[PDB]
Design an enzyme around this catalytic site. Sequence first.
Site, PDB file in Angstrom:
ATOM      1  N   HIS A 142       0.839  -1.214   0.000  1.00 18.73           N
ATOM      2  CA  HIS A 142       0.000   0.000   0.000  1.00 18.73           C
ATOM      3  C   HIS A 142       0.875   1.266   0.000  1.00 18.73           C
ATOM      4  O   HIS A 142       0.741   2.149  -0.847  1.00 18.73           O
ATOM      5  CB  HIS A 142      -0.921   0.009   1.226  1.00 18.73           C
ATOM      6  CG  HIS A 142      -1.755   1.247   1.361  1.00 18.73           C
ATOM      7  ND1 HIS A 142      -3.126   1.247   1.173  1.00 18.73           N
ATOM      8  CD2 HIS A 142      -1.423   2.513   1.720  1.00 18.73           C
ATOM      9  CE1 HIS A 142      -3.593   2.468   1.383  1.00 18.73           C
ATOM     10  NE2 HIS A 142      -2.582   3.250   1.725  1.00 18.73           N
ATOM     11  N   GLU A 143       1.771   1.350   0.971  1.00 20.27           N
ATOM     12  CA  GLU A 143       2.545   2.565   1.170  1.00 20.27           C
ATOM     13  C   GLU A 143       3.558   2.780   0.046  1.00 20.27           C
ATOM     14  O   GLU A 143       3.747   3.905  -0.418  1.00 20.27           O
ATOM     15  CB  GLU A 143       3.203   2.536   2.551  1.00 20.27           C
ATOM     16  CG  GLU A 143       2.205   2.602   3.746  1.00 20.27           C
ATOM     17  CD  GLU A 143       1.301   3.786   3.725  1.00 20.27           C
ATOM     18  OE1 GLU A 143       1.653   4.806   3.086  1.00 20.27           O
ATOM     19  OE2 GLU A 143       0.238   3.730   4.390  1.00 20.27           O
ATOM     20  N   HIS A 146       1.979   4.413  -2.912  1.00 23.55           N
ATOM     21  CA  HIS A 146       1.927   5.896  -2.874  1.00 23.55           C
ATOM     22  C   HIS A 146       3.128   6.510  -3.577  1.00 23.55           C
ATOM     23  O   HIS A 146       2.994   7.548  -4.217  1.00 23.55           O
ATOM     24  CB  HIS A 146       1.867   6.462  -1.440  1.00 23.55           C
ATOM     25  CG  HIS A 146       0.528   6.326  -0.785  1.00 23.55           C
ATOM     26  ND1 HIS A 146      -0.620   6.870  -1.320  1.00 23.55           N
ATOM     27  CD2 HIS A 146       0.155   5.701   0.362  1.00 23.55           C
ATOM     28  CE1 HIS A 146      -1.644   6.593  -0.530  1.00 23.55           C
ATOM     29  NE2 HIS A 146      -1.199   5.890   0.501  1.00 23.55           N
ATOM     30  N   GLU A 166      -5.657   6.861  -2.411  1.00 19.13           N
ATOM     31  CA  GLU A 166      -5.855   5.765  -1.404  1.00 19.13           C
ATOM     32  C   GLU A 166      -6.295   4.419  -1.963  1.00 19.13           C
ATOM     33  O   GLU A 166      -5.707   3.381  -1.638  1.00 19.13           O
ATOM     34  CB  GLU A 166      -6.847   6.196  -0.324  1.00 19.13           C
ATOM     35  CG  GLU A 166      -6.154   6.938   0.804  1.00 19.13           C
ATOM     36  CD  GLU A 166      -5.082   6.061   1.482  1.00 19.13           C
ATOM     37  OE1 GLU A 166      -5.434   4.920   1.879  1.00 19.13           O
ATOM     38  OE2 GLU A 166      -3.930   6.513   1.648  1.00 19.13           O
ATOM     39  N   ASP A 226      -9.977  13.939   7.617  1.00 18.31           N
ATOM     40  CA  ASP A 226      -9.232  12.939   6.826  1.00 18.31           C
ATOM     41  C   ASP A 226      -9.016  13.467   5.409  1.00 18.31           C
ATOM     42  O   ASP A 226      -9.237  12.755   4.447  1.00 18.31           O
ATOM     43  CB  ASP A 226     -10.047  11.633   6.796  1.00 18.31           C
ATOM     44  CG  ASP A 226      -9.313  10.480   6.161  1.00 18.31           C
ATOM     45  OD1 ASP A 226      -8.071  10.473   6.196  1.00 18.31           O
ATOM     46  OD2 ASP A 226      -9.995   9.556   5.636  1.00 18.31           O
TER      47      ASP A 226
HETATM   48 ZN   LIG Z   1      -2.462   5.242   1.922  1.00 19.90          ZN
END
Ligand SMILES: [Zn+2]
Length: 316
Positions: A142-143, A146, A166, A226
């Site tokens: 996931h990270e 990015h 996201e 958020d």
């Molecule tokens: Zn993320």
Amino acid sequence: ITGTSTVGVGRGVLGDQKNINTTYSTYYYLQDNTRGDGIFTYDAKYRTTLPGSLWADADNQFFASYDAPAVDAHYYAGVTYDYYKNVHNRLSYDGNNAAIRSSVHYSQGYNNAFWNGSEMVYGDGDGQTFIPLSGGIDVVAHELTHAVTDYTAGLIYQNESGAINEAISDIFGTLVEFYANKNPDWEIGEDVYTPGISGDSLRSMSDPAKYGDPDHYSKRYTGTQDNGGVHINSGIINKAAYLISQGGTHYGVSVVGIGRDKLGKIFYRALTQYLTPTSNFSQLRAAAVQSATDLYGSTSQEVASVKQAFDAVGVK
Ligand SMILES: [Zn+2]
Ligand SMILES: [Ca+2]
Ligand SMILES: [Ca+2]
Ligand SMILES: [Ca+2]
Ligand SMILES: [Ca+2]
């Protein structure tokens, strides 16, 4: 550091033994010379000054509990590297074999993990909400995704483009978990989330609503928390990607699933050829449709399935 490529062995966060590519120069460092311009893992030593010290070990054995998070950060960086290269012909996150750097033991009881613009950073969790976050291959991928997005579409991290940014990370984090093929699923962070509770995670792609996330555009979060709901409204895109891959009927709209590999192809193409920093949900749908058209043809099942999936989540 300059030295010879070596092979260490240790345990990850969940007690699994694995080999790691290390580098020898007096000490054995967590530096993997076998992928691109290197994968380097550092110790933040419970502080927040980054990156910390390149991880140095006396004997090339990584079985201490303190070693575990660094074992996983390093190893799952290598798996994610292999996924982008072998599946997408992408060499590291910038497409030019940039060094992949990660720091572990960030802060104290830090229930989070993130890409800071230059590197991966993993907390150890507080032992209740999280154990060390690098133990989750979907969290790692996931990270790192990015970083991929930052060098390609550059989706701004706010509102709709932010929720796409996201979702893209949940999608490829999940596809990386399937690629590694250890207990894969369509939830996010389950391997490191809440050690006392079975079967939960931070998010679900198959049923975003399980954790209170929208699964349809008419339920989008429109407030300011958020960054305008980037981890909330991703549920809408996550559900669409889940539908494209697996199929299903969602609010009365039937979707024919085309499988994970094709979902990965369509969304990698959208990411790298069509999406821009300000893309909204509707523009994502057009990018995914154009991607599927490039790859499989305009009359294809693949294109029809993309249209159905976005129809199912209320995105026109
Ligand atoms: Zn993320
Ligand atoms: Ca050791
Ligand atoms: Ca899993
Ligand atoms: Ca998962
Ligand atoms: Ca749990």
